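Consider the following input, taken from an annotated entry for notum (Homo sapiens).
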Amino acid sequence: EDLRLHLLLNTSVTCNDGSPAGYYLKESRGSRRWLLFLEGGWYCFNRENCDSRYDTMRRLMSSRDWPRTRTGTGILSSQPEENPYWWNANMVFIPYCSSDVWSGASNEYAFMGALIIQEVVRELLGRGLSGAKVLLLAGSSAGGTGVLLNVDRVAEQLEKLGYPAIQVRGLADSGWFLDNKQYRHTDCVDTITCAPTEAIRRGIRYWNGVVPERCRRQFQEGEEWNCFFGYKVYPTLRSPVFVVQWLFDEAQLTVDNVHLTGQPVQEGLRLYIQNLGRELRHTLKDVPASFAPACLSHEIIIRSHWTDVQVKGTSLPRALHCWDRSLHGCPVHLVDSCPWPHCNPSCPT
Ligand SMILES: *[C@@H]1O[C@H](CO)[C@@H](O)[C@H](O)[C@H]1NC(C)=O
Ligand SMILES: [Cl-]
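Applying the prediction step yields:
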């Protein structure tokens, strides 16, 4: 019972290199719950940048390497030991082969992230999704941000198509970033050197990216990049969204030009890092369903050890279960208050 690969029938919706996009599916006929997972793994924001990603990470720009089956992990696992509350769900894994944070709507690379999602949903309706009660759009890293950019379009899509009983919800893991100033400025030459703001501004135009309608209308024409930042887009969303976010996300630190060795940390950097945690906590204050441990890490929800981390005595699977119950003792808002990564003893290594 692996998830099984299906390539999109509309052959014009493609990965970056023109190969067909697709999705992996494990059906569970007794369940009315669907979990659609968006894979993450950075992005590229211009031709030179994508060329470089093509040479070091070709698998994220193509379908040509995808095996026909894959075993679900963490929240996609069918083993109750690994997924105690959601193991019986219908499981969908959408691989990330568009390098556009799932926003693309476009010789050259194609960027069709948002179209891919639109198309997957359409096809899943013929494979059981039409009888769903709950559709959880989940994602890690770029896929996390992707949830925030697409969850309401999916809700609108299903309503337009005549399926108003499906409850669409979001689960965004490691996709909630701050468009902050770097620790030390560096010119936008790479993907790792590049300030969060500049990466996206460049990317959006290069991808023909789209953002949620209501977030689009909150910023000026051409300033759609704002909606890539969770704390700005979140209040515009209608679907309920659970935000999982490490307080000291490695990708956040990377774009902030912070490169931790094993060494003692300098004064300037202790203030920076600590202030990052503080600002992140502040943005989460407004999010009623969240799980934000004080750890230095990146992604969690499809890692097999996702059951191990705890905030205030509650595990992440249990927090999500408590969130299911709240939408149908059991806390849903779980933010570490301690000021430095690994002050929580259940952090992974
Ligand atoms: C197939 O996908 C392309 C690319 O997005 C789209 O423009 C076209 O309308 C689609 N065709 C059908 C029949 O849906
Ligand atoms: Cl098959």
